[PDB]
Amino acid sequence: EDAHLKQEQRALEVERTVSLAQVYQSLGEKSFALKDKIEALLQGDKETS
């Protein structure tokens, strides 16, 4: 407990929002828009991913 009280600090607590449309959109050039590709991949019963 004394080692804990020595190693105790004040934390910096940062929130961040991750939007997956931006993430799958901003990639390497094998990238895609999330909405249309999920709509097509769930509409079609194909292997495609």
């Binding site: 009280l5 020595k6 105790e8 600090q9 004040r10």
Partner: protein
């Protein structure tokens, strides 16, 4: 050959008085460690101590 004088009588030795000496020692007192500050306010650290 019986002497006319009567023999002198010896005085017994004095016994020694065994005596003990009781002395005390002086150990030096300890000083304080360093003030390390913590995160907690007063009552929580007080109850902890």
């Amino acid at each position: 050959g019986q002497p006319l004088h009567l023999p002198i009588y010896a005085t017994p030795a004095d016994p020694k008085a065994l005596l003990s000496a009781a002395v005390a020692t002086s150990q030096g007192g300890g000083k304080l460690p360093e003030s390390f500050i913590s995160l907690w306010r007063f009552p929580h650290m007080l109850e902890n101590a």
